[PDB]
């Protein structure tokens, strides 16, 4: 989530005065090249380095990755609602997330570098196989970075993290 280890250099700037979604690239600043769903979407030659996705009311979405002087970084699955990606389903006030990789092993989930879906003492947070259910989802509290990884593996080793921002 907060860390960029694991080639997860793409992060969302949560410091916007207006409802605009800005993306940042954590690479040695020479020139930043932005990509969206594999296609190049911009090339920042010095000066500015953040990529603006527009207003959050437009529900920006896609697999975003950047690249400096090294190879392209891992994708950042952006999912706003105001490689196989994570599946997001909204039904009323319940948000369901599906782990893209479900080989049948014990799937663990983490939100903002904090494990979730393990304890049964949470009625609004349930984990069923590769599906994580969030009942009565809180926009200000339950939004952020999400990642699914199997027991024994590092969360930073995931192919990509999911950035969920939903108003329900």
């Amino acid at each position: 989530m907060q860390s960029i280890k694991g080639n997860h250099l793409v992060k969302v700037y949560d410091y916007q005065e207006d409802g605009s979604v800005l993306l940042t690239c954590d690479a040695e600043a020479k020139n930043i090249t932005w990509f969206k769903d594999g296609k190049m979407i911009g090339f920042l030659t010095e000066d500015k380095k953040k990529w603006n996705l527009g207003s959050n009311a437009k529900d920006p979405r896609g697999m975003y990755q950047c690249k400096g002087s090294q190879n392209k970084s891992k994708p950042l699955q952006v999912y706003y609602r105001m490689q196989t990606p994570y599946k997001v389903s909204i039904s009323g006030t319940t948000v369901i997330l599906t782990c893209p990789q479900y080989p049948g092993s014990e799937i663990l989930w983490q939100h903002n570098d904090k494990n979730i879906g393990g304890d049964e003492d949470d009625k609004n947070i349930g984990s069923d196989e590769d599906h994580l259910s969030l009942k009565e989802f809180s926009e200000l509290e339950q939004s952020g970075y999400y990642v699914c990884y199997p027991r024994g593996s590092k969360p930073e080793d995931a192919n990509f993290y999911l950035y969920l921002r939903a108003r329900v």
Epitope: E106, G118, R151, G152, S153, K154, D157
Partner: single-chain antibody, 465 residues
Framework: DIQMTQSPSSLSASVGDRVTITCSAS?????MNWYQQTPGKAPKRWIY???KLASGVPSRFSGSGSGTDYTFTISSLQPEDIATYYC?????????FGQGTKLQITSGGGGQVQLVQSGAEVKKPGASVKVSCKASGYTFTSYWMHWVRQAPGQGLEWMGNIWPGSGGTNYAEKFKNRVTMTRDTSISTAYMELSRLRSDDTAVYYCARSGGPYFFDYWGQGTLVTVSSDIVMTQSPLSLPVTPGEPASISCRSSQNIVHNNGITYLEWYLQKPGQSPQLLIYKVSDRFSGVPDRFSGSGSGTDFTLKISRVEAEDVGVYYCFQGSHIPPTFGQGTKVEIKSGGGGQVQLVQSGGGVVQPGRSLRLSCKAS????????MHWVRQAPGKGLEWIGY????????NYNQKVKDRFTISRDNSKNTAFLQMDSLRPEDTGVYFC????????????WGQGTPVTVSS
């Protein structure tokens, strides 16, 4: 499963030379772990994350590599570096360990004096037993093969010598009419025949080799001859426990003055580490033998002698027997079984139990008691080490959630359970087979370090008819 290949399988290097061990994985591994495993001990983690040295690991060791190629480097090989080095991958279950690099010190080309006894003798009352000691690496006719016995519940007691050069034996008064020792110079092997076996003769009889300034310098493996139906030196402490790092001290008192007429005191202390034959620690009243760290430092004069260990370490556990030879029949004391006060508790410790000899097809349950940390916060893994084979992962269990994963070879015969209230993990083996014989060790898996940092002492399991 990702296959790990370690090269070389056995490397001989001189003291101070650079020893490099390479580990090849069948598939790219994110992190490779390096463990140091001495003979008879559990593997000790040396390098984690492929480049970070474990706590206490000397800077002369270094790990490097990425993907499927990893390298382990010892900048300056030392005599203490003699151990089995194995590389382990944690990217995918089961945790795969390489065949292991048997690291030996080429320095010391002169034949290592290694006496081997017969061993495993079981007899009946009133019988006679003959035990041999194949002397190798030394001119068998230039050092007396003194033979000593250590009965259960008693200290070392000399059983008389034999000077293999001439066959002219001395003998012990307690066996002067019962035990005869004869040399066989051709095969470089002394023999000792004790006649009229009684109940009190059931013991472990060892073959020493009286060196220049120290008696019983290089001791044989030791033969347990179980048969069933004098300057007295007393060791003041007995089973005196100490804390890891806390200094310990054992005192020994002699019946008379142990100052020989020659002016040299033949007082010594042998440290029979648990499961090994005694190895000299204080060659004379004060001098420490070679190969023994400066931690052991005895003292004493007249008739009073006390050995002061500067810092009781993990290795020093074992009955330190004090022997005096300035009298005719050299006699050893009771011996203080110095043991760790913390034991299975204190720091992070895994106490392994439940081993033994079982018949094929029977069931055996192993237990690993964890103390010093939150049992539910770490995964407990089980590893089996067959005689002459490398480390094989059996399975692991998470105490917090109860999720279990096992190797496909033992998934249908081994069951891993845990007791969070006792902070103990259980490895239940059903339908035991001869191939299951080996040392079963439990290891604590630190997800933060992606390496098993704390491992149990190992429980020997023997499947024999």
């Amino acid at each position: 499963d990702i296959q790990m290949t370690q090269s070389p399988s056995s490397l001989s290097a001189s003291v101070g030379d650079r020893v490099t061990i390479t580990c090849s994985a069948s598939s790219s591994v994110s992190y490779m772990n390096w463990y140091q495993q001495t003979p008879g001990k559990a593997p000790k983690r040396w390098i984690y994350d492929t480049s970070k040295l474990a706590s206490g690991v000397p800077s002369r060791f270094s790990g490097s590599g990425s993907g499927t190629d990893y390298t382990f480097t010892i900048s300056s090989l030392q005599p203490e570096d003699i151990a089995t080095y194995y590389c382990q991958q944690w990217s995918s279950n089961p945790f795969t360990f390489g065949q292991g690099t048997k690291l030996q010190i080429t320095s010391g080309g002169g034949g290592q004096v290694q006496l081997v006894q017969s061993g495993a003798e079981v007899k009946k009352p009133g019988a006679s037993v003959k035990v041999s000691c194949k002397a190798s690496g030394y001119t068998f006719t230039s050092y007396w093969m003194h033979w000593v016995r250590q009965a259960p519940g008693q200290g070392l007691e000399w059983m008389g010598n034999i000077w293999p050069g001439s066959g002219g034996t001395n003998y012990a008064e307690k066996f002067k009419n019962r035990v005869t020792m004869t040399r066989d110079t051709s095969i470089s092997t002394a023999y000792m025949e004790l006649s009229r076996l009684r109940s009190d003769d059931t013991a472990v009889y060892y073959c020493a080799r009286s060196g220049g300034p120290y008696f019983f310098d290089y001791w044989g493996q030791g033969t347990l001859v179980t048969v069933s139906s004098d300057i007295v030196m007393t060791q003041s402490p007995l089973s005196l426990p100490v804390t890891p790092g806390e200094p310990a001290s054992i005192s020994c008192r002699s019946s008379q003055n142990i100052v020989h007429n020659n002016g040299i005191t033949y007082l010594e202390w042998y440290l029979q580490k648990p499961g090994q034959s005694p190895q000299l620690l204080i060659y004379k009243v004060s001098d420490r033998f070679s190969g023994v760290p400066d931690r052991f430092s005895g003292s004493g004069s007249g008739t009073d002698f006390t050995l002061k260990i500067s810092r009781v370490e993990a290795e020093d556990v074992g009955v330190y027997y004090c022997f005096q030879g300035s009298h005719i029949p050299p006699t050893f004391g009771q011996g203080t079984k110095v043991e760790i006060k913390s034991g299975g508790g204190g720091q992070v410790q895994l106490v392994q139990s439940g081993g033994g000899v079982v018949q094929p097809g029977r069931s055996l349950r192993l237990s690993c008691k964890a103390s010093g940390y939150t049992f539910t916060r770490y995964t407990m893994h089980w590893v089996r080490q067959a005689p002459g084979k490398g480390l094989e992962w059996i399975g692991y269990i998470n105490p917090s959630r109860g999720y279990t994963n096992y190797n496909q070879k033992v998934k249908d015969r081994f069951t891993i359970s845990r007791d969070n209230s006792k902070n103990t993990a259980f490895l239940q083996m059903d339908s035991l087979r001869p191939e299951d014989t080996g040392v079963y060790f439990c290891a604590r898996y630190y997800d933060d370090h992606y390496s098993l940092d704390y491992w149990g002492q190992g429980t020997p399991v023997t499947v024999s008819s």
